[PDB]
């Protein structure tokens, strides 16, 4: 209540405070507790193999230099005080680009406790790398992690833990990606060794399951409809050369445009995806339908009736095998 | 352990320290050792002729002004101390855009040693130029370098070396580019002379080998399938003018759309690439197939049988010569 008294207390705390030295410098490591409140996952990019996360990132530790007596309150201080305090040198090892939000002020919190516990909160948006295995795309499941580490302090000096264990990360229910469902999240803690020493690591990972629905509609259904269209030829009279050759060409060429368009939406991976396998099967069907007419044309100057049954039957088999293997 | 003692020692180190003067100013050059730990190569752009690298960049040197006694520890200091120290004026001569990561703090380390050795680490993402020779594209091998130099200090004042020789650069195994394999990396050291004097240079280069697989699927296979499609005409009766002319047109026009699309994904180079040569060969085949019908049409108002053998045989020869020359 007495603001001069509080001002005196806080001034005393910061008098001769050396930001250069961690708490308990030269002694046992400082234990830093971390909890995350997820705000959003804005974007997941296959082409860039990354995702964009917004979170409230909080750090808990004790700094005995900041302990104060005679005030039975937790002091919430203006965020600019953070520039006069030691804070951990935490970074995100797999981040590509990150920033602290700055409107209307830097989205930062400092709360002091009588025993010298410091609560330091930041609101961060990070674009973080996530290498994806697209062999089963778009029937794939991905593992995207966020790796949290101390930059310069080894485990001799700093230690990390998930504050609250399995409850340290909140807000997973808020994630609303149209193309993915969050199946699971996991929290891991370990030490990572480099040439410069052993460093504390915390890892947050998510399991993402792609929703098929968009792909059924966008690529699978057009390809099925083109393949069915190709079969119309077999009900046309063999003398209708222009009509039957037109059907063959248009379906074959449409299947090429669909293929090439699709792979321009994705990174230039050297392997065959699940969707590639489907489109290649559909291409073979429609190409053989045109070649069937070439054969009919070749001998007429029977086969159609055999084609009317064998082609739909083979395509059904093809689809059955495909969707069983991958679903 | 005694933080007041450590604070006193460090305060004494920085008392009267002149950041303007390099260590051993006016004397022999300061030897600066460099080590890189590669985190990722995020992107390689043919259109922009550049690549994006993330690395941990470390600098090692001795500053006798920072030597301290009576503490048998290496002091890891808060990264903000870097603003009170001399550091080398290292830059990347072929970089286009670079930044030091800033969340949650500046990704920077300072470690002092009792003998006055300073360890200065930065986590940097750089987009760096890489002029590519696309004459054999996409069967090409590229050499992309990173050129590291002192901006203002000549070799009279500063010297660079790879700390650890051939082990100075780690993490090459981490690079995961879908479209490229890293064949080799090399470390070079030399002096570079400009009008303002001789400057120390370190060069890190990689040899990148393009993976063919994507290109086989995306461009080569469609072109082969269009060329085969063109041959169907020769099995169609010569009276089927609409059918056979349709085949000629559609294949010719499809080959033009493929060509023009492809070169819109690439820089506006004035020379012919390997892929251009293939597409031009395929165009000639399908164009001649249509012209073959014009000739047949021209005289009927034999040639087809001769076309049924000579065209597939010539295309096989064409492919053989092409893929031998370039693979």
């Amino acid at each position, epitope marked *: 209540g007495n603001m001069s008294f509080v001002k005196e207390t806080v001034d005393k705390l910061l008098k001769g405070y050396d930001i250069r030295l961690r708490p308990d410098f030269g002694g046992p490591p400082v234990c830093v507790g971390m909890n995350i409140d997820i705000a959003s996952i804005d974007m997941v990019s296959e082409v860039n193999m990354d995702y964009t996360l917004t979170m409230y990132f909080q750090q808990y530790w004790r700094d005995k230099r900041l302990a104060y007596s005679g005030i039975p309150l937790n002091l919430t201080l203006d965020n600019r005080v953070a520039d006069q305090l030691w804070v951990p040198d935490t970074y995100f090892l797999n981040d590509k680009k990150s920033f602290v939000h700055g409107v209307t002020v830097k989205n930062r919190m400092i709360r002091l406790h009588p025993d010298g516990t410091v609560l330091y909160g930041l609101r961060i948006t990070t674009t973080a790398a996530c290498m994806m295995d697209l062999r089963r795309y778009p029937l794939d499941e991905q593992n995207c992690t966020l790796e949290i580490e101390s930059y310069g302090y080894t485990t001799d000096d700093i230690e990390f833990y998930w504050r609250g264990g399995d409850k340290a990360v909140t807000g997973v229910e808020r994630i609303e990606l149209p193309q993915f469902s969050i199946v699971e999240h996991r929290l891991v803690s370990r030490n990572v060794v480099f040439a410069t020493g052993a460093y504390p690591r915390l890892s947050l990972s998510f399991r993402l399951k792609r929703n098929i629905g968009y792909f059924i509609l966008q690529t699978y259904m057009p390809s099925i409809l083109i393949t069915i269209l190709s079969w119309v030829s077999f009900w046309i009279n063999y003398d209708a050369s222009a009509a039957r050759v037109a059907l063959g060409i248009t379906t074959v060429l449409t299947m090429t445009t669909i293929n090439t368009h699709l792979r321009e939406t994705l990174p230039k991976i050297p392997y065959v995806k699940a969707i590639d396998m489907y489109l290649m099967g559909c291409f073979v069907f429609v190409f053989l339908a045109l070649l069937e007419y070439a054969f009919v044309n070749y001998i007429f100057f029977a086969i159609d009736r055999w084609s009317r049954i064998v082609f739909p039957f083979t395509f059904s088999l093809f689809n059955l095998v495909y969707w069983l293997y991958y679903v | 352990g005694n933080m007041s003692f450590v604070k006193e020692t460090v305060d004494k180190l920085l008392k009267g320290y002149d950041i303007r003067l390099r260590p051993d100013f006016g004397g022999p050059p300061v030897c600066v050792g460099m080590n890189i730990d590669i985190a990722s190569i995020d992107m390689v752009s043919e259109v922009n002729m550049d690549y994006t690298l993330t690395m941990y960049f470390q600098q090692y040197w001795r500053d006798k002004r920072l030597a301290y006694s009576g503490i048998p520890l290496n002091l890891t200091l808060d990264n903000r101390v870097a603003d009170q120290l001399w550091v080398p004026d290292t830059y990347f001569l072929n970089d286009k855009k670079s930044f030091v990561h800033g969340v949650t703090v500046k990704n920077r380390m300072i470690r002092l040693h009792p003998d006055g050795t300073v360890l200065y680490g930065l986590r940097i993402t750089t987009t760096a130029a890489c002029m590519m020779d696309l004459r054999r594209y996409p069967l090409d091998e590229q050499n992309c370098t990173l050129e590291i130099e002192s901006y203002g200090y000549t070799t009279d004042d500063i010297e660079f070396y790879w700390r650890g020789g051939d082990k100075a650069v780690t993490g090459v*195994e981490r690079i*995961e580019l879908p479209q490229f394999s890293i064949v080799e990396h090399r470390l070079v050291s030399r002096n570079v002379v400009f009008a303002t004097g001789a400057y120390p240079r370190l060069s890190l280069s990689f040899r990148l080998k393009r993976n063919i697989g994507y290109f086989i699927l995306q461009t080569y296979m469609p072109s082969i399938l269009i060329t085969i499609l063109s041959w169907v005409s020769f099995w169609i009766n010569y009276d089927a003018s609409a059918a056979r002319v349709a085949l000629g047109i559609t294949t010719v026009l499809t080959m033009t759309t493929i060509n023009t699309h492809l070169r819109e994904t690439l820089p506006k180079i004035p020379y012919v690439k390997a892929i251009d040569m293939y597409l031009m060969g395929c165009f000639v085949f399908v164009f001649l197939a249509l012209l073959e019908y014009a000739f047949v049409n021209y005289i009927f108002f034999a040639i087809d049988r001769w076309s049924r053998i000579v065209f597939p045989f010539t295309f096989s020869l064409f492919n053989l010569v092409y893929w031998l020359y370039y693979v």
Partner: nanobody
Amino acid sequence: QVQLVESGGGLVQGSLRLSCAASGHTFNYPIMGWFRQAPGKEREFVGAISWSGGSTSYADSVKDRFTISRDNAKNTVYLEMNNLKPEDTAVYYCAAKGRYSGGLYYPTNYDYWGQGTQVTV
């Protein structure tokens, strides 16, 4: 979750080919390492290979003696131990490293350890 089974050790006086067959989620663990533990001594780095690319690294002791490579079809890595020496007498272990799990050289960075072939010469 990776399982590693290694074979082709044994006792010889010579060229040898240790093999290391992986199965499971190998995508999350792109690097395979070869270690060796002599009796008494600490577990020691030999070499490592990326599954994708085959980017290779060797300890000095075995540089220009041993050669590692792999085949992604079988999910197999092999240490071709040529020009053997009586120093090369240890339980050779295979291990997998996570993408972000630190330096190649440090066995504590590795998660999934093969059984370990004893090799004496």
